[PDB]
């Protein structure tokens, strides 16, 4: 005899090959359930010809007549004497026909669309203090050096004599000029000081109220910046199904009438009803209808598209801006299907675990599930601060000291200009 | 037999359901109300077909007349038999029909605006530190200046050579004046420094300790608004209604002629008729017509609106900026209305107690008044400090500067008249 | 007749009057329960005569013969006509005997020791770094200010010329004193400098050494004075089952064999079992006998006692160490008890909700419930920084300015010695 | 009729029940195991009599004789009838006796000791800026001090009278040379200040501009270590079994020709070959006798221990400093152990997948591996830093305060040579 093997379309299980050769008979199918069906007929003995499903189902009752349908059909009329495919073993399906001993395991998991980190810019450090601030605190630099100027001019005791060595008199003069002026408050704002400190009680006001307020703006900045990267440092992505419980503006997602969205009909969980009562409310929405639409939901939008974890193993890694946040919350199993009470079903499972032992379905795990590179190594670090995040001081650095260059070059020839 | 039970609608009780189809009967309405009543034919075996009441109302007597209006009108004159709604246990209507025991406990509260913190206070810099050490810091400033003058005297290493260019002329000079004594202990309060450096041992003991109470004044200040700035917790003014029968500015307000206003107007607490004396007399500003009406104009105004207790876990719950501020102040029950003198009156009352200690009598308001949740718990980016949080330190800068004028004419003023 | 009205002696409900007298009848008795049915009796008609139940209890199925016990034997034997005491309204005592409506409402809620709020202390400020570190920053002070001395004598750079105005020789000098070179180290430590500033450069690289380990210094004092100011700002109390649900820290506490522990058997919510599973758990130890032996636990260890609303607004009013964290969790009532179909069920129940809408039995609950002053006022608040946690930095400069005065004393006596 | 069922002692999963009484049976044991068996029993109708194994061993085959030892032996010759117990599915038992479909799922993991924070690094403050920031600062100072020589030497204005005690002497002299450029650019790094400040419009725009710079510079390095001392977010130096093939410090560990030992000899995986290569040229440090033994090593050694998955949960749940890197390294899974050839094996097939559809044999686990909890994601205060958190402060500080002496060694034989 030869077994009739039927089998669904699926990636990384029975695809067709990229050839062009049009007369293919048994050659003509790959994958990961080709594999495992050389590698059973290998060690059995047995010689096998793939024949596909038909109506392209796995299989359900469609309540009308209480006929299974799709590849369990076919084993329970004994069209077909195994079942190579991802027929998960479940309730419902192991009363109709005999499952052998599972070669995956697979579970619920979650699609997310991997975090995207924002760039701070390059001046992020302005961030801790509105634009509006960072004006005001400059107009308060050209505002109250202006005021100064006017007061130390006018003032009398600022007027001081500035040789105690020699007594003498009409030698009296300033050190507030408008260029010194700017100086002390410059120099004050960067709490550095300076070599002025004003001598009159009138130009001590205006000094001692500036120094106020530049313990307020200097103690609100560090304040801010520590309240910036605390709130950056404290947060964290979804790395669980109660993280994506509690938060809606994630999106949730499923496949309309699935496995997974049955899941959370029958769940008793408390945190597992109220992920239905999200999918409840908001159907129409967050029930798309199969699992390849619901990637490109994830793709778009800020969807978190509940699917089985075999094939997230195979689109994260063959798409490195996808990711699987959280572990797995059902747990299923693969099996080969074969018809109720068929010799074949001991045998197989003897076979399959064979398999496992000297570590054949490991290495066709990672031969179909692996893909190319996908740059995903991606070391993403945080909350040291680096050139990212606090360049722009380094830039504004430079833009000043090219600037002064250009004023020497002006002092220089404003000099010579006046000795010439 | 099918019983008549009649039912308003009021959401979360009893609702239009709303799919797409145009023929219906008993699946239009979905709820509170009738996941009680489909609990009770579970338990009890009678049979709903939920007749709506006519002309919208609970029940209320005419006071020419002497008849019902509603509910309590068709149970008086047998039209229903059941009367599933929020229909409230009071005294007149137990005259009448036969209620049930209570399956939902409520009262009177008070809706009011969540707060916000967008309005902190133009001086919300001043926060970190009480006002006790904002004033004890200032009189440390003018100990210490004090002691500095007093100190710097009588020690005779204070008093120096100030002719440093020749070598020995008698000439000896204190800089430590009462002006310069306060410009050190005011310089070294704002971390800048004046240009006097205290030169003995005693006056350095003084500027040495005044120098490390200065630090940790400081670093008190910058910490103590680094915990302000990333751990917001926003207050209310009001807290409960003993705290809105002093506050004027915060308005009351409740449905006219409703079962709240009727409450505060019959009652002889002194909180309550301080409540009412505000609320009989003023009108059409404190007091609305319907209760949707009101929490409109809490959400617009500033406004404190008296209504049903479990209304606002209904509306508090999806409208996040609306919250409960107080307790409960009266305290009803909704009872499933009988007939005068009912069978069902006691296999109900058995009924709704078995729902009750079973648990599924408290799972239906967890699944009806309970909506989105919006978890604003977690701390966001702390909102960068503009013109609304520092603020009145250009306050400040503006009265320093403004007063340093005042003494610049003032001294000015003193030495023309002393050069004449 | 007279009605014979069996009831139980709990507290605030009946109760012996504290007098001598000892020839009492019906006037033995006050409390909750006495004011009640002497305004029902009122308002009624009936005449009463008080007979205490003679076997303790309330009433529940002993299980060896069916035969209720307590209140409800009596009441369903017809040796009584009513029950006015907290028989609370359940499913298995409303089959037996018919109860009123309730005159109270009830749940279960937590007691817990009211938060003693931690003294900092007056010198909290020194918290942000250990006493090993403080100690070695004085080390350091002293070693560094010793290093600069030796340096500043050996190495020849330092020795200038303090005549730039004269060209003179033999008067090189240097600055750094002994005394001098502890006001550099101590002037660089508080970060606002001195009139030094090291000439040579071997002095200098012990000056810029100083300058950086001084900024480590401060900045590792603010940056661990806002880690401690804002986890102290973050954490909060326990105010619901679900923070009383995690933390094991916290023991809980229930009456065993009562109707508090019955609740968490049959629950089915998923916070509630949680707590269940503690209980059975550490029994023995988290299972006390009564109401009266889990109020000292509370009052003892760390404790989170699980009763009755009711009887913890009595202990908690006349106890102000002691608090109720959380809210209602079950939700039953009281009610006066009949006989199973009485003629007085009717009447009681529109003659309790008459008390209700003339506000009776609010004012009831607050002669019996309200009791001393009890100075639970206790305006507690937090993080704002006041005298209680940041004082001692006031001792400590009072401190330094006794002693500088008496170093002013001990230089003016050691002057008038030298010149002497 | 009753069957006969094996049962092997293992924690969660069969245990001696204990309260006080002597007479037993059926009633001593508790678990995962009792607590499936008495739902299958449910289901399937049959009864326990749970009798345990001889000889305390799941099942091997001798390798002279030939025989089996404990479940498997007892199953093959049927002295028993199920063994319901962790009897892990493999090749070799799976042709001796017939399993039925798993009921949990399993693997290798690794357990290590949970990251402490006990040790961060001596340099522990150069944390919160990147290694190449504090290299780009260092040479901002080098690179501004140039450009303040440049600048200084050709603007006029920097070029004063240093003689101003005498009115016109022609001397003129710069202050700003490459000694003291350097000195004002480490001088206002830290927020010290030189005694130079320049004084031209050249100078004092690289002045002002590197005062700015520093500003931020010493702002962000106090708020980003203000976000690590609050927030502290421990990793651990091993995150898979890749990364145990390179850490050569941190050792392995198994137990003696366990299942875990069976698979790192027979694999042909790259690591697995790595893995096995220490572990078997190395022994008594690197493999233990028991996993009991085996978790001691990790408590107290720096050990990483391979083992079962499913013990690990059990074991990290109930010792909190104990956590379970990686992830399953395997994959096998524990079966209901049946005769071979038997009825019982299918109808427990059925079975155990009607009690995981229904979600039963998930909430078993749920209830048998989770302990105390331990909520430690609450951040305590932040414990002060000492000489392990700031640390090397003290040693840069030695480490300038010898280099400073063998320069000031070094410039004393440079005059001495000078002015010989
Ligand atoms: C402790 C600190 C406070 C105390 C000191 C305060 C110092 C006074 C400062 C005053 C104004 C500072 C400029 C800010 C203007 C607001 C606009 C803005 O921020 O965005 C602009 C950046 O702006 C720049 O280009 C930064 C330039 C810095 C100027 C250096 C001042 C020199 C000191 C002289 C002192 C006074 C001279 C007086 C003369 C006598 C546009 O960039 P962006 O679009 O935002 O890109 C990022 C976008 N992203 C993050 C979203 C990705
Ligand atoms: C880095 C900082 C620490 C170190 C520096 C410490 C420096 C010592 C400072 C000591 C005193 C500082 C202010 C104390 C105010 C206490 C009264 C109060 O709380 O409310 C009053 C504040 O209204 C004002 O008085 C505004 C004045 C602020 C600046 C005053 C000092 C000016 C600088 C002088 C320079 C030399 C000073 C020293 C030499 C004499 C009333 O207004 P309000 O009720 O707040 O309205 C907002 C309501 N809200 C906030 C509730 C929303
Ligand atoms: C930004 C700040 C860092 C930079 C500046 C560092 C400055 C250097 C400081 C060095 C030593 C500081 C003393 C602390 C010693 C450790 C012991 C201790 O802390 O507890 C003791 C307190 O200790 C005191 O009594 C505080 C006295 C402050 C000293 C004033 C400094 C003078 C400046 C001169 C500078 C050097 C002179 C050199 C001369 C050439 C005992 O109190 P307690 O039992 O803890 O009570 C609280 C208990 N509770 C909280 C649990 C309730
Ligand atoms: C407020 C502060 C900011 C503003 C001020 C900035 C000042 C400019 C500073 C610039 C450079 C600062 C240090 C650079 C360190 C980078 C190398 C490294 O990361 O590791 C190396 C650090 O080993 C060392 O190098 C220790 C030296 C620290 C002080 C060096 C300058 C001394 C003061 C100079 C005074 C003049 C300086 C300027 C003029 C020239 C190797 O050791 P490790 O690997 O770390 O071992 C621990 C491992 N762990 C951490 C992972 C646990
Ligand atoms: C060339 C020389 C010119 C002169 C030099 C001076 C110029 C430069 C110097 C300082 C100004 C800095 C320039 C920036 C512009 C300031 C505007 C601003 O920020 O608004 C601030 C107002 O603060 C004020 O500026 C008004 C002044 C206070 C009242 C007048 C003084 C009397 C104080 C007491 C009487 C005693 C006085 C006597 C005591 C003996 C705050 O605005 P706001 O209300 O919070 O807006 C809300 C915005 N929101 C909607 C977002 C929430
Ligand atoms: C607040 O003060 C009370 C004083 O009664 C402290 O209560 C003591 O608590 C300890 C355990 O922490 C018990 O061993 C003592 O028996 C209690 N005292 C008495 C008199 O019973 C309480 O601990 C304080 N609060 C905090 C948070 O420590
Ligand atoms: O359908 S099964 O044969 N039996 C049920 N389950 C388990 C819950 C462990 C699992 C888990 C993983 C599988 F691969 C198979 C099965
Ligand atoms: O209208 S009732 O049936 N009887 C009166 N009361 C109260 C005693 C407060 C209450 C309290 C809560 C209810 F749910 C019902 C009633
Ligand atoms: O025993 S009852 O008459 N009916 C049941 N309940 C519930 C509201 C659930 C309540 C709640 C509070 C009561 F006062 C009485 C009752
Ligand atoms: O020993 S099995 O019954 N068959 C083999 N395998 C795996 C293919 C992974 C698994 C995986 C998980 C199981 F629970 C059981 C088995
Ligand atoms: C706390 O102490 C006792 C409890 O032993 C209590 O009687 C007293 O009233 C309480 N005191 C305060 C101030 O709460
Ligand atoms: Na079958
Ligand atoms: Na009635």
Redesign the pocket.
């Known amino acids: 005899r030869s077994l009739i093997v039927t089998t669904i379309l699926e990636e990384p299980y029975v695809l067709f090959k990229k050839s062009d050769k049009p007369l293919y008979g048994n050659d003509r199918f790959e994958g990961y359930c080709i594999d495992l069906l050389r590698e059973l007929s290998t060690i059995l003995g047995f010689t096998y010809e793939i024949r596909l499903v038909e109506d392209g189902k796995y299989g359900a009752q469609d309540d009308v007549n209480g006929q299974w349908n799709g590849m369990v059909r076919e084993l329970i009329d004994h069209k077909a004497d195994l079942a190579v495919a991802p027929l998960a073993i479940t309730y419902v399906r192991e009363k109709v026909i005999d499952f052998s001993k599972p070669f995956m395991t697979l579970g619920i998991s979650i699609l997310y669309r991997k975090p995207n980190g924002t760039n ?5 450090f ?2 801790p ?1 509105s ?1 509006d601030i ?2 005001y ?2 107009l308060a ?2 505002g109250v ?1 202006c005021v100064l100027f006017v007061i130390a001019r006018f003032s009398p005791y600022e007027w001081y004599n500035p040789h105690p060595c020699n007594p003498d008199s009409d030698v009296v003069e300033n050190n507030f000029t408008l260029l010194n002026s ?1 100086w002390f ?2 120099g004050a ?2 709490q550095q000081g300076s070599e002025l400190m004003p001598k009159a009680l009138s130009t001590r006001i205006v000094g001692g109220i500036w120094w106020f307020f530049t313990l307020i ?2 103690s609100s ?1 560090t304040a801010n910046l520590a309240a910036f990267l605390t709130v950056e440092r404290m947060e964290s992505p979804i790395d669980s199904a109660d993280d994506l419980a509690k938060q809606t503006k994630i999106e949730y997602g499923a496949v309309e009438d699935g496995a997974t969205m049955t899941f959370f009909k029958k769940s008793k969980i408390s945190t597992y009803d109220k992920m239905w009562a999200f999918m409840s409310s908001r159907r129409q929405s967050v029930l798309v209808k199969s699992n390849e639409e619901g990637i490109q939901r994830v793709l778009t939008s800020d969807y978190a598209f509940l699917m089985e974890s075999t094939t997230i193993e195979f689109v994260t890694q063959r798409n490195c801006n996808l990711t699987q946040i959280g572990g797995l919350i059902d747990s299923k199993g693969y099996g080969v299907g074969t018809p109720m009470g068929s010799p074949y079903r001991d045998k197989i499972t003897i076979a399959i675990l064979q398999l496992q032992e000297e570590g054949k379905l490991h290495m066709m795990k990672e031969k179909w599930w692996r893909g190319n590179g996908c740059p995903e190594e991606e070391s993403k670090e945080a909350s040291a601060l680096g050139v990212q995040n606090i360049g ?1 001081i380094f830039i ?1 650095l430079a833009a ?1 000291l090219v600037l002064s260059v250009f004023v020497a070059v002006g002092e220089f020839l404003y000099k010579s200009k006046k000795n010439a």
Do not use: A, E, K
Not at 120 to 124: A, E, L
């Open positions: 701070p810019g390059v001046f992020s302005l961030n203090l634009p960072w004006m605190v400059l630099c050209l050096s700017f408050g410059v704002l960067m703006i200097i900045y722009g504004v000043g």
